[PDB]
DNA sequence: TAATTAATTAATAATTAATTAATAATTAATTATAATTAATTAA
C-alpha cells in the first residue's frame, strides 16, 4: 500500500527513451512503483507530494543522465536523498549510469562545468558546496554502466530481479 | 597549434497565465404595409 521504490531522472532526456519500460517491466514483479513528471515549481520543495514518498520509499534507486546537473530541482533533491540515507543506512542506493563515464561524476568536471559555471551567479557560496559534497559520494557506489552498444533491454531485466531479490528473500 | 579550465563583457523561440479585441449567424419568437380579384350598394 506504501512505496518501495522512488526514482529520479532528467526532464526530457530520459522520461520517455528507457526510464518508461523500466518503469513499466516493473510492474510486472508486482511491486509498486513511484515516478512523477509534475514540475512543481509551486513554491520552492513541496511536502505532501515529494517529501512524502522519500521517507515511505525502501530502495532510492535514481538513475543519473547526461544532463542531470542543469536542473535547479534534481540537484538539490538528490541532496536530500544521500543525505537521509547517510542518518538511517537500513536502505541502500542502487545508481545507473548512463552514456557517461564514471569519471565526470566524481569531480563535476567535463560535461558539467558549463553547467556549475552559471549556476554559480545565483545561489549561496556554500549550497554549491553542499551539491558537490553530496553528487560525489554517489559516484562511488555499484553501479551498471550502459555504454553506447549495451542492450537497452537486456539489462532491465537483470537490474529489475537485483530490485526484487531483495524484496523475496528480505 | 589544438585543447580545456579560469575572470569579464556581449545578443529568438516557446509556452505558462491575466485581460481586452469578431457580429457573424441561425434558430425560437415579437410588431408594422401595399394592392388585386369577387360580390352588393349609391350617380
Given at each position: 500500500?506504501?512505496?518501495?521504490?522512488?526514482?529520479?531522472?532528467?526532464?526530457?532526456?530520459?522520461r520517455?527513451?528507457?526510464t518508461?519500460?523500466?518503469?513499466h517491466?516493473?510492474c510486472?514483479?508486482?511491486?509498486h512503483?513511484?515516478?512523477?513528471?509534475?514540475?512543481?515549481?509551486?513554491?520552492?520543495?513541496?511536502?505532501?507530494?515529494?517529501?512524502?514518498?522519500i521517507?515511505?520509499?525502501?530502495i532510492?534507486?535514481?538513475?543519473?543522465?547526461?544532463?542531470?546537473?542543469?536542473?535547479?530541482?534534481?540537484?538539490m533533491?538528490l541532496?536530500?536523498?544521500?543525505?537521509?540515507?547517510?542518518?538511517?543506512?537500513?536502505?541502500?542506493?542502487?545508481?545507473?549510469?548512463?552514456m557517461?563515464?564514471?569519471?565526470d561524476?566524481?569531480?563535476?568536471?567535463?560535461?558539467?562545468?558549463?553547467?556549475?559555471?552559471?549556476?554559480?551567479?545565483?545561489?549561496?557560496g556554500?549550497?554549491?558546496?553542499?551539491?558537490?559534497?553530496?553528487?560525489?559520494?554517489?559516484?562511488?557506489?555499484?553501479?551498471?554502466?550502459?555504454?553506447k552498444?549495451?542492450?537497452?533491454g537486456?539489462?532491465?531485466?537483470?537490474?529489475?530481479?537485483?530490485?526484487?531479490?531483495?524484496?523475496?528473500?528480505?
Amino acid at each position: 500500500v506504501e512505496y518501495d521504490v522512488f526514482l529520479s531522472f532528467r526532464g526530457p532526456d530520459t522520461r520517455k527513451q528507457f526510464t518508461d519500460f523500466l518503469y513499466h517491466f516493473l510492474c510486472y514483479y508486482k511491486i509498486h512503483t513511484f515516478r512523477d513528471d509534475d514540475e512543481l515549481r509551486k513554491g520552492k520543495e513541496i511536502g505532501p507530494n515529494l517529501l512524502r514518498a522519500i521517507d515511505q520509499s525502501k530502495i532510492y534507486v535514481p538513475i543519473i543522465s547526461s544532463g542531470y546537473a542543469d536542473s535547479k530541482w534534481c540537484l538539490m533533491e538528490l541532496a536530500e536523498i544521500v543525505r537521509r540515507q547517510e542518518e538511517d543506512p537500513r536502505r541502500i542506493i542502487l545508481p545507473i549510469f548512463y552514456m557517461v563515464d564514471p569519471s565526470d561524476v566524481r569531480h563535476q568536471t567535463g560535461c558539467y562545468k558549463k553547467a556549475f559555471r552559471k549556476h554559480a551567479n545565483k545561489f549561496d557560496g556554500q549550497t554549491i558546496q553542499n551539491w558537490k559534497d553530496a553528487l560525489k559520494k554517489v559516484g562511488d557506489l555499484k553501479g551498471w554502466h550502459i555504454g553506447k552498444d549495451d542492450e537497452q533491454g537486456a539489462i532491465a531485466d537483470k537490474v529489475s530481479a537485483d530490485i526484487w531479490s531483495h524484496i523475496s528473500k528480505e
